Nucleic acid binder design. Structure first.
Lengths: 65, 54
DNA sequence: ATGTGGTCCCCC
DNA sequence: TGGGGGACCACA
């Protein structure tokens, strides 16, 4: 579960995942972004990625199942 | 083009790039949950927070 | 040089 | 509407 050096004109790193290499961007539905950004602003974080870090740790106990 | 979304701080894009570290953990949750859309995993994550309500 | 976040215009 | 691929800007 690790990071993959970039191949072109982009130099962003992909990640190797359970299903293989994958880009680090995700699109959210309008339905879902509304609540995600509510979570991020409640925390005050400027970078989205730190909010999902926060969510993943809080969901730790429910992960591991 | 994809619509934006209005939030506590104005319009924001709905595509987020995650730090490689974060991206690895999240895609772990997604693939374990078996969801086809990353949103669904984000839904599931938010649902497991008694603590959004601090 | 080789990465970062975030977005730009394309495809399905 | 729902996605992602490749490129690009601006910054380490």
């Amino acid at each position: 579960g690790h990071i993959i050096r970039a191949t072109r004109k982009d130099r962003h790193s992909k990640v190797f995942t359970s299903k293989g290499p994958r880009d680090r961007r995700v699109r959210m539905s309008a339905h879902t972004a509304i609540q995600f950004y509510d979570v991020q602003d409640r925390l005050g974080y400027d970078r989205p990625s730190k909010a999902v870090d926060w969510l993943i740790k809080k969901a730790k106990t429910a992960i591991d199942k």
